[PDB]
């Protein structure tokens, strides 16, 4: 069976993250100041969300719930909480380890289940498994009732020891922690909704149904937009200690939790048919990938606890969960697809990513060109990288129309697509070189002509060499296999040349500029994901679907890298 309507996921990510991007663009532009944003937030959190919760809680058929699925997602969230909690207590300093162990486990476990989770689960499962949408309104509140009072208890313990008590009365610490979690609209409107579920026998009165529809339907768009507004100005410059803790907590949230969810569902929910069980453990995985809840950042800013790591981490967790949800959901869907419709689905993914990536790149390029920054170094060289990324995205669009049409168009469009693709790799190298030569070799002139010649000619030399030395693999749909093993060898050698050049240069540089360094680092990370995926493809001699999985991992960066350069330069507040 299809298990997930996976083709509905990209439009649903573009809905949810495009509304988050609208809120961000609005707050950055000061269309809505931070003072004004609290009105949307108070509407969202105190009117729209509590109505959405009440509606769904009253309607819920509790005898239709897979309780072992709830227990296993809750045991996965509770064990990640316990892991991050115990580790934070053991690793952090005695002066703040209870503020850290309070909120770092809440961060690693409280998903944005209602605003991001629900629309994405509705997109994936409303047709194949409409019952999966019940578990958001169950898991998310029950996870608050378990885990948020434990983190609030740790925060009250910090204040109790900071005020130099040997102990306070423990009942007031546990009582205020519990009372603070009961005061959250999420918890008490779930309690009220569970009560009215029984009082009404699940029939929402016709009078109240449309009132709850109007408030409930308003939550999704307004909460994503409020989330975007709350991201403005939250990525503080962090020390390396704060930055490594942030990477570890975003890892706990977006990698360890979804792996533990998938495992806990497979170990604890053993009472179902293999199709349901596989779909349900796949659902458990993408439940773990939902980003940190803005409620943790709202708590951190109001308590003034760990504000830098938690507000920055909530923003980076939000943004990073979008590609991880996409990549993860497709990886989990791939086992259901036959190799031929799978190949077309991966090309359709690449067309989708390259359409939206090309639009974001055209905006970013226009911004770089109109700001007239494109005449400086490093900006000329970042503008050449964005042009290479734009010819890559347009090339994938043209390829999806040409893919099996005719040999003349295929060869020219492959030359365009792969020369511009190798060019994006070599431009990550050459841009990182120019940052090394600008920061360190100030006296020495940078050869702009030789750099523009190398960034465009060496890719075209590599593509010419490949058309000469390779055999046409015309039995293949995928551009990432149109010249066979020697194309993955050429791709991998180009990635290794670029990661050498860019690693050498950003190292020697450490031995405007912050945006370009950050771009080169994020692109280097992407090139290392592509290199490791391409080397792993080249080393696997035994046949498998693993080939088309690794081609999908490569394609996501090849065509999606326009979003890294849009994120850094399309949204640069300096232009």
Ligand X SMILES: CC(C)CCC[C@@H](C)[C@H]1CC[C@H]2[C@@H]3CC=C4C[C@@H](OC(=O)CCC(=O)O)CC[C@]4(C)[C@H]3CC[C@]12C
Q: What's the rounded Cα separation, in Å, for the pair 243 and 237? A: 9
Q: What sign has the CA pseudo-torsion 105, 28, 244, 256?
A: positive
- In the complex, minimum distance from the CB of residue 222 to ligand X, in angstroms, rounded to a whole number: 17
Q: Taking the mean position of all CA atoms in its chain, how far away is CA 95?
A: 33
- Is residue 400 within 8 A of residue 429, CB to CB? The reply is no
Q: Which is nearer to ligand X, 383 or 561 (CB)?
A: 561
- Is residue 451 within 8 A of residue 381, CB to CB? The reply is yes
Q: Which is nearer to ligand X, 147 or 506 (CB)?
A: 506
Please tell me whether residue 6 binds ligand X under the rule CB under 6 A: no
- In the complex, minimum distance from the CB of residue 555 to ligand X, in angstroms, rounded to a whole number: 10
The CA-atom distances, in angstroms, between 35 and each of 42, 294, 308 are 11, 17, 20
Site for ligand X in 540-559 (CB under 6 A): 556-557
Site for a second copy in 422-441 (CB under 8 A): none
Please tell me whether residue 319 binds ligand X under the rule CB under 6 A: yes
Q: What's the rounded Cα separation, in Å, for the pair 141 and 316? A: 23
Q: Pattern of binders to a second copy over 91-130, x per CB under 8 A?
A: ----------------------------x---x-------
Q: Pattern of binders to a second copy over 339-368, x per CB under 8 A?
A: -------------x--xx------------
Q: What's the rounded Cα separation, in Å, for the pair 126 and 5? A: 9
- Of 63-71, 135-143, 209-217, 536-544, the window that binds a second copy (rule: CB under 8 A) is 209-217
Please tell me whether residue 563 binds ligand X under the rule CB under 6 A: yes
Q: Which of 4, 19, 21, 534 binds ligand X (CB under 6 A)?
A: 21
- Of 90-98, 334-342, 361-369, 563-571, the window that binds ligand X (rule: CB under 6 A) is 563-571
Ranked by CB distance to ligand X, the top (closest) residue is 567
* Residue 355 known to bind ligand: no
SS3 track for 36-76:
HHHHHHHHHHHHHHHHHHHHHHHHCCHHHCCHHHHHHHHHH
DSSP conformation letters of 361-398: HHHHHHHHHHTTGGGSTTHHHHHHHHHHHHHHHHHHHH
- In the complex, minimum distance from the CB of residue 234 to ligand X, in angstroms, rounded to a whole number: 4
Q: Name which of ligand X, a second copy, none residue 561 binds, using a CB cut-off of 5 to 8 Å depending on partner kind.
A: ligand X
Q: Pattern of binders to ligand X over 515-544, x per CB under 6 A?
A: ---x---x---x------------------
Q: What's the rounded Cα separation, in Å, for the pair 528 and 505? A: 15
Q: Name which of a second copy, ligand X, none residue 232 binds, using a CB cut-off of 5 to 8 Å depending on partner kind.
A: ligand X
* Residue 10 known to bind ligand: yes
Q: Name residues whose C-beta falls within 8 Å of residue 110's C-beta, 6 or more positions apart in sequence.
A: 143, 144, 147, 148, 292, 293, 295, 296
Please tell me whether residue 573 binds ligand X under the rule CB under 6 A: yes
Q: Which of 166, 206, 274, 408 binds a second copy (CB under 8 A)?
A: 206
**170 CB-contact burial (10 Å; exposed 0-12 / middle 13-18 / buried 19+):** exposed
- Is residue 306 within 8 A of residue 103, CB to CB? The reply is yes
Backbone angles phi, psi at 273, to 5 degrees: -65, 150
Q: Pattern of binders to a second copy over 19-58, x per CB under 8 A?
A: x--x---x----xxx-xxxxxxxxx--xxx----------
Site for ligand X in 25-64 (CB under 6 A): none
* Residue 250 known to bind ligand: no
Question: Which residues are annotated binding-site positions for cholesterol?
Answer: 10, 24, 233-235, 515
Binding residues for ligand X (CB under 6 A): 13, 17, 20-21, 24, 231-235, 315-316, 319-320, 322-323, 326, 353, 518, 522, 526, 556-557, 560-561, 563-564, 566-568, 571, 573
């Amino acid at each position: 069976p299809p298990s997930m309507s996976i083709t509905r996921l990209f439009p649903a990510l573009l809905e949810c993250f495009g509304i988050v991007l609208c809120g961000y663009i609005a707050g950055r532009a000061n269309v809505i100041t931070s003072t004004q944003a609290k009105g949307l937030g108070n509407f969202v959190s105190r009117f729209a969300l509590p109505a959405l919760l009440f509606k769904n809680m009253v309607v819920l058929n509790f005898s239709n719930v897979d309780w072992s699925f709830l227990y296993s997602i809750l045991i996965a969230k509770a064990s990640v909480f316990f892991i991050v909690c115990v580790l934070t207590l053991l690793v952090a300093s005695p002066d703040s380890r209870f503020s850290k162990a309070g909120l770092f486990p809440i961060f690693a476990t409280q998903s944005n289940d209602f605003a991001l989770g629900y629309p994405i689960v509705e997109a994936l499962y409303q047709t194949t498994y409409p019952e999966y949408l019940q578990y958001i309104y169950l898991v998310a509140p029950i996870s608050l009732m378990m885990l948020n009072p434990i983190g609030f208890i740790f925060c009250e313990i910090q204040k109790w020891k900071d005020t130099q008590n040997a102990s306070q009365n423990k009942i007031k610490i546990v009582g205020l922690g519990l009372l603070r979690v009961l005061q959250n609209p999420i918890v008490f409107m779930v309690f009220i909704g569970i009560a009215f579920n029984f009082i009404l026998d699940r029939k929402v009165p016709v009078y109240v149904e449309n009132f709850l529809d109007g408030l409930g339907n308003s939550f999704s768009g307004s909460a994503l937009f409020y989330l975007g507004l709350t991201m403005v100005g939250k990525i503080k410059r962090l020390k390396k200690s704060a930055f490594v803790v942030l990477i570890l907590l975003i890892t706990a949230k977006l990698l360890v939790l979804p792996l533990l969810c998938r495992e806990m569902v497979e170990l604890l929910d053993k009472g179902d048919s293999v199709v349901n069980h596989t779909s349900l453990s796949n659902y458990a995985f993408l439940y773990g990938v939902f980003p940190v809840a803005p409620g943790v950042a709202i708590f951190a800013t109001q308590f003034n606890m760990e504000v830098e790591i938690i507000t920055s981490g909530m923003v980076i967790s939000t943004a990073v969960s979008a590609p991880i949800m996409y990549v993860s959901a497709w990886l989990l869907t791939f086992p259901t697809m036959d190799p031929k419709p799978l190949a077309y689905a991966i090309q359709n993914v690449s067309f989708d990513i390259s359409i939206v990536s090309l639009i974001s790149l055209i905006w970013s390029l226009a911004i770089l060109l109109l700001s007239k920054k494109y005449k400086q170094l490093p900006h000329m060289l970042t503008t050449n990288l964005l042009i290479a990324q734009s010819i890559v995205c347009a090339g994938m669009m043209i390829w999806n129309f040409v893919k099996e049409k005719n040999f003349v168009g295929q060869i020219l469009v492959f030359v365009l697509l792969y020369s511009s693709l190798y060019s994006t790799y070599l431009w990550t190298g050459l841009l990182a070189i120019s940052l090394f030569l600008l920061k360190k070799r100030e006296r020495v002139q940078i050869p702009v002509g030789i750099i523009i010649i190398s960034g465009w000619g060496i890719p075209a030399l590599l593509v010419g060499v490949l058309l000469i030395t390779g055999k046409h693999n015309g039995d293949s749909i995928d551009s990432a296999f149109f010249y066979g093993k020697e194309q993955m060898i050429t791709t991998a050698v180009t990635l290794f040349c670029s990661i050498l050049i860019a690693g050498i240069s950003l190292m020697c540089m450490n031995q405007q500029l912050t945006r370009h360094v950050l771009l080169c680092l994020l692109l280097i990370i992407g090139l290392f994901a592509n290199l490791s995926s391409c080397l792993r493809w080249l080393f696997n001699q035994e046949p498998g679907r693993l080939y088309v999985e690794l081609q999908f991992f490569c394609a996501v960066f090849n065509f999606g890298q326009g979003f890294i350069s849009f994120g850094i330069f399309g949204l640069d507040k300096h232009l």
